[PDB]
């Protein structure tokens, strides 16, 4: 495995985006979900990193 991939596994903890979160996301600045392919903390929202 790439180091980045193991990293992506360890840092798969983000379930704070909603109260009943279906999964734990890899920590992203816009809460990007790779499998589904749309942001869970979009730039329009107040829950993105910035």
């Amino acid at each position: 495995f790439n180091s980045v991939k193991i990293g992506a596994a360890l840092q798969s903890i983000d379930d704070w985006w909603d109260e009943d979160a279906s999964k734990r996301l890899r920590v992203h600045e816009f809460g990007a979900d790779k499998e589904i392919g749309v942001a869970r903390r979009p730039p329009d929202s107040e829950q993105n990193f910035y």
């Binding site: 979900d33 589904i36 392919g37 749309v38 869970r40």
Partner: protein, 402 residues
């Protein structure tokens, strides 16, 4: 001028206005029309510009561009001819946004009709608005029910409607002739003789024009409102290409056996699905195998009250994914469904189904690459989990309880 004749419950606007000029203050409708044109021109130029001289294009649904001005002209007509307020506006055949599957509709008191089913629409070079003769014998006026193409015999007199003149054999049109009681050909004697009835066909049509409550053997004449009863007839026509056919007895005998006729039609499409395949099931669209059978279905925009046709279609698709479990070989339950076909199966607006795509609730079936905005007709989602999403929402007549 003050007309003393007053509108009936179901009298048409042309019928009442011809019965106004039937009083011998004016010789013809044109004389009255030019006189009110002058009086509108002296009052208001816009309402004058709206008000047409002929009786042809006087109904509100004809005027696409000056409907608001037409109502203003009609309202001034009521004010000017010594009539109460709204008197002409209740007889009007008003506009309607509701589309009968990309077919513009027309509003009468409580009931919206597809514009194909109207007789006097568009003005076909020579057409007939058919007349109950011994119905004119009691009172000389035109009911709104005779303008519908399905109505051929009704009802208190129990007699077939008269289409053509007994002298010339020219079709009877009270708009063209400007005469309710008389023909242009003469009609010198009283109302002519009739072919009686099939006798059981009348209790079919009397079940149609009954308003909004009561059940029976036939799903068409079951607990429904009249506007959706027409929706079922329009669906029936375009399925078998009965566009010019307007025989009521050819529909009610068909819909009497409803569940069995549509299941067996959909069963052969499932058995012969593998035959038609140019590509794999997970790459082929739904309309490639089944053909138009989802987006032709009557819409459930009303109340969130589902159509009996819609309840019968979906309940077949629920048992399709039941028989086709989720294995590594793709099967009939991996057919691609578009956002409009998805919108109908959920029974919601198309923006609401895009918003489910926006929050990744419903998962497309291939990834668009960043500037791909989904084509509304291109098959996006699988039939599979679009149904499972619909079985996550419980309604009373699910097969789970029994």
């Amino acid at each position: 001028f003050s007309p003393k004749a007053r509108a009936f419950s179901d009298e048409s606007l042309e019928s009442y206005l011809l019965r106004v000029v039937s009083e011998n203050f004016f010789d013809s409708y044109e004389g009255l029309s030019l006189a009110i044109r002058e009086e509108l021109h002296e009052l208001d130029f816009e309402a004058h510009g709206a008000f047409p001289v002929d009786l042809k294009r006087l109904n509100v649904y004809h005027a696409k561009h000056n409907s608001h001005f037409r109502m203003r002209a009609l309202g001034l007509l009521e004010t000017l001819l010594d009539l109460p307020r709204y008197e002409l506006q209740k007889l009007a055949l008003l506009k309607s946004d509701i589309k009968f599957n990309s077919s513009v509709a027309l509003y009468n008191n409580g009931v919206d009709i597809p514009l194909r089913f109207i007789r006097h629409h568009a003005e076909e070079a020579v057409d007939s608005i058919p007349v109950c003769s011994q119905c004119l014998a009691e009172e000389a006026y035109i009911k709104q029910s005779w303008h519908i193409k399905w109505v051929n015999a009704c009802t208190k007199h129990q007699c077939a409607l008269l289409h053509n003149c007994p002298e010339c054999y020219a079709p009877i049109n009270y708009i063209e002739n400007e005469s309710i009681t008389h023909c242009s050909c003469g009609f010198e004697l009283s109302c002519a003789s009739t072919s009686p009835v099939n006798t059981l066909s009348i209790e079919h049509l009397n079940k149609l024009l009954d308003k909004g409550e009561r059940n029976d053997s036939n799903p068409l004449f079951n607990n429904m409102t009249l506007t959706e009863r027409f929706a079922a007839l329009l669906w029936y026509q375009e399925r078998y290409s009965q566009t010019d056919n307007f025989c009521l007895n050819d529909a009610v005998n068909y819909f009497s056996k409803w569940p069995a006729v549509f299941n067996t039609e959909l069963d052969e499409l499932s058995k012969n699905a593998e035959m038609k395949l140019i590509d794999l099931f997970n790459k082929t669209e739904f309309k490639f195998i089944f053909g138009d059978a989802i987006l032709a279905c009557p819409s459930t925009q009303k109340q969130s009250e589902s159509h009996f046709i819609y309840r019968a279609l979906l309940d077949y698709l629920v048992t399709l994914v039941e028989s086709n479990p989720k294995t590594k070989k793709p099967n009939a339950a991996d057919l691609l469904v578009s956002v409009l076909e998805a919108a109908t199966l959920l029974g919601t607006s198309v923006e609401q189904v895009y918003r489910l795509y926006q929050n990744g609730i419903l998962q497309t079936a291939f990834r668009h690459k960043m500037n791909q905005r989904i084509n509304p007709y291109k098959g996006a989602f699988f039939l599979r989990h679009v149904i499972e999403y619909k079985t996550s929402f419980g309604n009373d007549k699910a097969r789970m309880y029994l």
